[PDB]
Amino acid sequence: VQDALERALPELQQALSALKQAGGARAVGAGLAEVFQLVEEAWLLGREVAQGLCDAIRLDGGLDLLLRLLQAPELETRVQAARLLEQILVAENRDRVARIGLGVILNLAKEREPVELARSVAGILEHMFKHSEETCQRLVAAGGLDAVLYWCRRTDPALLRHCALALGNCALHGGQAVQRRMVEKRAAEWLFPLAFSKEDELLRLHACLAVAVLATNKEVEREVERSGTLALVEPLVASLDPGRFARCPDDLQRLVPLLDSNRLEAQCIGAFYLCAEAAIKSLQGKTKVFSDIGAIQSLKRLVSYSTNGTKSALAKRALRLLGEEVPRPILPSVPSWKEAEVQTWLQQIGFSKYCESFREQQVDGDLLLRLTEEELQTDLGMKSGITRKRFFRELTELKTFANYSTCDRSNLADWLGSLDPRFRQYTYGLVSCGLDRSLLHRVSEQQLLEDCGIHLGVHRARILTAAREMLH
Amino acid sequence: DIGAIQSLKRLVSYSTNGTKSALAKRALRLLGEEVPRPILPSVPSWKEAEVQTWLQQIGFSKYCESFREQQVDGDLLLRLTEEELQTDLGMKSGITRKRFFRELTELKTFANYSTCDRSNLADWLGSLDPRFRQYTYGLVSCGLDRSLLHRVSEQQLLEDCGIHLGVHRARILTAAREMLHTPDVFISYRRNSGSQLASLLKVHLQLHGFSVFIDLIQSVMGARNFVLVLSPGALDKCMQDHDCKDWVHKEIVTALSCGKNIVPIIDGFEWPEPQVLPEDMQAVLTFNGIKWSHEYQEATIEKIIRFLQ
Numbered sequence: 001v002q003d004a005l006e007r008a009l010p011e012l013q014q015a016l017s018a019l020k021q022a023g024g025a026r027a028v029g030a031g032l033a034e035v036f037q038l039v040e041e042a043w044l045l046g047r048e049v050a051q052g053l054c055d056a057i058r059l060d061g062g063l064d065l066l067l068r069l070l071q072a073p074e075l076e077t078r079v080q081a082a083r084l085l086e087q088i089l090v091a092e093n094r095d096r097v098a099r100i101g102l103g104v105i106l107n108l109a110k111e112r113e114p115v116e117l118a119r120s121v122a123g124i125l126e127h128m129f130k131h132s133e134e135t136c137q138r139l140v141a142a143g144g145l146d147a148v149l150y151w152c153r154r155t156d157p158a159l160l161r162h163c164a165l166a167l168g169n170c171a172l173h174g175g176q177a178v179q180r181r182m183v184e185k186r187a188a189e190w191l192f193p194l195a196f197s198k199e200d201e202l203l204r205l206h207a208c209l210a211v212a213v214l215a216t217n218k219e220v221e222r223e224v225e226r227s228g229t230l231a232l233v234e235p236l237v238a239s240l241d242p243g244r245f246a247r248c249p250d251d252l253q254r255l256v257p258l259l260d261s262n263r264l265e266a267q268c269i270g271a272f273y274l275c276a277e278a279a280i281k282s283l284q285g286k287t288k289v290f291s292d293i294g295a296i297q298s299l300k301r302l303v304s305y306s307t308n309g310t311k312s313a314l315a316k317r318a319l320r321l322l323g324e325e326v327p328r329p330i331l332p333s334v335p336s337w338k339e340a341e342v343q344t345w346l347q348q349i350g351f352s353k354y355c356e357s358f359r360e361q362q363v364d365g366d367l368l369l370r371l372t373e374e375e376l377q378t379d380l381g382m383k384s385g386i387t388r389k390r391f392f393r394e395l396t397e398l399k400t401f402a403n404y405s406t407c408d409r410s411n412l413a414d415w416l417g418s419l420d421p422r423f424r425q426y427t428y429g430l431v432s433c434g435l436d437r438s439l440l441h442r443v444s445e446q447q448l449l450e451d452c453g454i455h456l457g458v459h460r461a462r463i464l465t466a467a468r469e470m471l472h
Numbered sequence: 473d474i475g476a477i478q479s480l481k482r483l484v485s486y487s488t489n490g491t492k493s494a495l496a497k498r499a500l501r502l503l504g505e506e507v508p509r510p511i512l513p514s515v516p517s518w519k520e521a522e523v524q525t526w527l528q529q530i531g532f533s534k535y536c537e538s539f540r541e542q543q544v545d546g547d548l549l550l551r552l553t554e555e556e557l558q559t560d561l562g563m564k565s566g567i568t569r570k571r572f573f574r575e576l577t578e579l580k581t582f583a584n585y586s587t588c589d590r591s592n593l594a595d596w597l598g599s600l601d602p603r604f605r606q607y608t609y610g611l612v613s614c615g616l617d618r619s620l621l622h623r624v625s626e627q628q629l630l631e632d633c634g635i636h637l638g639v640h641r642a643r644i645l646t647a648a649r650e651m652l653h654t655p656d657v658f659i660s661y662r663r664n665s666g667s668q669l670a671s672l673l674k675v676h677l678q679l680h681g682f683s684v685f686i687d688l689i690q691s692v693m694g695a696r697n698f699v700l701v702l703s704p705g706a707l708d709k710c711m712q713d714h715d716c717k718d719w720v721h722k723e724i725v726t727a728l729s730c731g732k733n734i735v736p737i738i739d740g741f742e743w744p745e746p747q748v749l750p751e752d753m754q755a756v757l758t759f760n761g762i763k764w765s766h767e768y769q770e771a772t773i774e775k776i777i778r779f780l781q
């Protein structure tokens with residue numbers, strides 16, 4: 001508690017006074033080492049104590065004098081002062097470094113032959129990339145990202161870990177321009193060695209997190225998949241165990257898009273990281289942050305429509321750690337569903353209050369896959385257009401992943417998917433209309449709109465043009 | 473009285489730049505009001521709590537309960553219409569709806585559409601006009617990209633995309649219609665030792681235009697050239713491999729049979745003796761070897777390229 005802080009405060013003052021008073025390089029290094037040991041002692045305890053020491057360093061002006069030591073010519077004091085900095089770049093400090101500290105750390109990153117200094121400045125860049133977007137553009141536009149790549153070229157283990165974390169944090173907090181710059185600067189290729197190497201598991205895990213966060217961007221998927229780095233994500237996630245890493249909030253807001261990525265490797269990485277976080281933080285008293293974020297619903301959607309074993313296992317274990325019971329898998333053959341399957345699907349998608357209404361009207365797979373605005377509005381009681389739009393989004397989710405073999409005859413679902421992944425929702429309407437691959441070249445706009453149910457005009461135009469052109 | 477607090481809050485909430493953020497935050501901190509909290513640019517990935525925070529920041533705090541009950545999120549917020557506000561959410565007043573639309577356009581203009589956009593359509597819309605970028609989510613949700621825009625019509629935009637203003641639709645349509653119109657190297661490595669050097673070699677060669685396969689006989693078939701990673705004890709399994717158990721043995725035997733260029737890469741491993749190795753494979757020792765330098769990796773890769781086809 002704060003009693004340890006009270007004990008460390010005279011130690012903090014003595015260490016800072018010795019560090020500032022020291023004029024010789026070795027004496028400065030000794031004071032910096034005193035501060036380094038004090039900071040590590042607080043970290044080993046716990047988070048509040050280290051944050052308080054970092055606050056005291058800022059109040060004393062010790063971070064500005066630390067920057068002064070960064071501009072110092074002597075190599076040893078630079079190296080070990082940089083170790084102190086990489087230890088103390090807590091969030092309030094990153095602000096002040098964003099203000100004036102930037103532009104000097106870049107100078108450190110320009111020359112990197114000393115291994116320990118290179119490791120320390122790599123960690124410093126890693127920590128600064130998390131702070132804000134303008135910091136990301138300022139660092140990436142300069143030679144910082146080139147420094148990170150060249151450090152990834154080197155074989156130092158801690159340096160490689162730091163560079164993997166740096167690239168990951170830059171990916172999470174960069175934005176469109178920053179990530180496009182990273183892609184153009186060949187980030188995925190240089191992340192490949194970090195993920196592929198068998199020496200360190202955490203290194204590959206962090207590199208896979210970075211490449212998954214890159215793959216979350218639709219435009220980036222070109223270059224990430226052409227790099228080939230994501231191919232190692234799935235075997236890795238299948239291999240390692242979250243529990244031993246557990247033994248070994250805003251970040252969770254960053255991770256949740258990985259669960260809702262729609263990309264396999266990104267979902268695997270997000271499931272693993274969130275399961276590890278759920279374990280370690282459910283070891284703690286409170287578990288509310290996951291519900292605040294919406295992680296439970298995303299994991300339930302992951303389990304319910306899962307096609308792949310590893311994601312299923314990770315999401316199931318993550319939800320099993322929490323108090324909620326595991327969502328139950330759904331049968332892909334929706335046209336063959338019954339009333340109970342509809343009730344289960346409604347309970348899973350969150351529309352539990354409408355289970356009674358669907359049961360009284362006896363909705364089944366045919367009715368569910370041919371439900372319209374009017375039926376929900378009047379028959380089932382979804383008066384709210386927002387609620388109806390939500391139900392339509394989830395119905396499109398169900399229809400996209402469904403088994404239409406019992407109904408389809410000409411493999412029309414694959415054709416619709418080949419035109420567009422989201423076109424597959426219309427397969428049941430098209431087949432119930434009696435249309436097949438051969439019959440599509442006599443279809444008109446009004447027929448689609450009225451009978452098939454393709455409300456959007458753009459989708460109808462694309463479908464008609466593609467049918468008329470390629471089907472002949 | 474002037475409205476400075478609201479303007480500073482709007483400055484902090486949608487700030488992209490550090491200095492303005494700092495100044496507005498300190499100015500509001502001097503006053504009794506608490507600092508407005510920054511919003512995540514990726515609005516399509518928002519949740520209910522992000523919507524509640526954004527509503528509280530834009531001044532529409534009284535509608536937070538209504539948005540929460542209907543569970544509005546990033547998709548719903550970015551595809552909200554006149555009717556939904558009027559009936560579902562309770563914004564009966566057209567003035568209030570127009571204010572909410574102004575702030576929604578403010579949010580949509582500065583938003584991250586990378587998770588949704590595929591052809592960088594937001595930059596195209598912004599290039600036509602800075603205020604055109606609000607329509608990016610509607611256009612991408614419609615399935616349109618840069619290539620698909622040259623078949624779009626006015627009615628499609630108006631109904632599906634949500635571009636109510638006719639002038640914007642005309643400009644977008646005119647602008648679209650007018651301006652819119654076997655690996656080279658195989659890597660064989662020891663799993664425990666050769667993997668890291670193999671990774672460096674593969675990434676360096678792919679940077680320089682050489683396709684490389686890593687991680688089986690058909691793999692030797694497809695390879696234009698064969699590169700063996702002579703890691704410390706690389707041929708440890710290959711020594712006295714009469715049964716050809718090692719995959720490296722099979723790969724290199726097949727490479728010699730096919731005649732592909734085999735380039736040993738010595739990095740920390742001595743040349744294996746001919747007598748201990750099987751007779752068929754004593755020929756690879758005669759092939760030229762390349763030293764690998766940690767200090768100069770690019771020089772080593774340039775040497776490989778000079779030896780590469």
Ligand SMILES: O=P(O)(O)OC[C@H]1O[C@@H]([n+]2cccc(S)c2)[C@H](O)[C@@H]1O
Pocket residue numbers: 043086087088089090091127
């Ligand atoms: O601001 P953040 O990244 O949340 O943490 C603050 C600093 O703590 C150091 N550090 C080191 C070893 C253990 C721990 S707990 C924290 C990190 O290097 C970071 O610079």
